Design a binder for this molecule. Structure first.
Ligand code: NI
Length: 341
């Protein structure tokens, strides 16, 4: 059964609610982004209207085979009427195709659902500038002050400089980057661009990338692994055994691997600056964990919420324990007392 924080009162709508069967009263199912915890339940047999971005619609059609007649793509930054209710989709600064949804309820209430997001000051000049929000359904993944990490630009600067140094010292080194979902594509794209290479990958991953509307993608990626010195592999293979096994397959073209594991936050963020990060090394294999986040830091989140000044907040992440729920409610009250709303 569908939980309360996935329902939008006063409408026939749900958000990210595909794993509960037929939801009573639902006339349109919204999908914020193509991550498995959110799409869990969709397939070619789904027969209700799905509302989403163009990019999410490309992924639903090609990767999950949802039939075309049930896919409803909406443009961003544009007022749209869905089943008699005005909605807007906004870029969430998460993975490709990810949106926040603004719902203008028939009684005058305005609701923002963030989906998964990485808050940014640029959001303070979207269509959110223009009006009040009564209810915020908030991505609270990192809602505690211990969660710190650098900007995505600092993290990419570190990766490009690390890869370019290593391959200039050794032209026979291969670079490998782990992946397990869409998102974080700048990691492997920026490294391949500095090296003058296409990115090599499996047919399955190439298919996924081809749904993303990335400009000039045909110039950047390939399934011909032999022509490429940046390879993508499943995240589960980014370990000494998996990488050893991979280097055997490369026909004596390479004599070293440098690998990157993009993660979210890890506790080593509580001690070590990005500049000071070192790899784990065994023999001719080195592995860097790099903290490339597609979710708000605590400070980014707080800034956004103090600017928006919502009347009520409903968290959408970390809702399963009393301790998590209590901690989050405490911070919402500080923020409100500090800013005066
Ligand atoms: Ni996500």
């Amino acid at each position: 059964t569908c939980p309360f924080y996935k329902k939008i009162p006063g409408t026939g709508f749900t958000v990210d609610a595909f794993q509960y069967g037929v939801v009573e009263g639902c006339t349109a199912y919204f999908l914020t982004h193509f991550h498995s915890d959110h799409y869990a339940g969709l397939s070619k047999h789904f027969t209700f209207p799905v509302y989403c971005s163009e990019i999410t619609g490309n992924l639903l059609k090609n990767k999950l085979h949802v039939q075309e007649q049930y896919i409803h793509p909406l443009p961003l930054d544009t007022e749209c009427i869905v089943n008699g209710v005005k909605v807007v989709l906004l870029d969430a600064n998460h993975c490709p195709g990810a949106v926040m949804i603004l719902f203008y309820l028939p009684n005058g209430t305005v609701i923002l659902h963030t989906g998964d997001f990485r808050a940014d000051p640029s959001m303070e000049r979207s269509l959110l500038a223009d009006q009040k929000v009564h209810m915020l359904y908030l991505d609270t993944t990192y809602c505690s002050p211990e969660y710190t990490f650098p900007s995505q630009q600092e993290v990419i600067r570190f990766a490009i400089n690390t890869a370019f140094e290593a391959v200039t010292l050794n032209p026979h080194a291969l670079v490998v980057c782990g992946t397990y979902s869409i998102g974080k594509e700048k990691v492997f794209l920026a490294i391949a661009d500095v090296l003058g290479s296409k990115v090599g990958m499996s047919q399955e991953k190439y298919k996924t990338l081809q749904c993303l509307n990335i400009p000039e993608i045909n110039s950047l990626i390939t399934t011909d692994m032999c022509s490429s010195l940046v390879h993508l592999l499943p995240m589960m293979q980014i370990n000494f055994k998996g990488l050893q096994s991979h280097l055997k397959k490369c026909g004596g073209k390479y004599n070293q691997i440098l690998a990157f594991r993009p993660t979210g936050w890890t506790h080593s963020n509580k001690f070590t600056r990005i500049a000071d990060v070192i790899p784990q090394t065994k023999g001719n294999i080195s592995i860097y964990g790099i903290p490339y986040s597609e979710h708000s830091s605590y400070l980014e989140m707080k800034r956004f919420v103090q600017w928006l000044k919502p009347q009520k907040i409903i968290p959408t992440v970390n809702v399963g324990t009393w301790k998590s729920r209590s901690t989050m409610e405490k911070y919402f009250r500080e923020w409100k007392l500090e800013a005066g709303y």
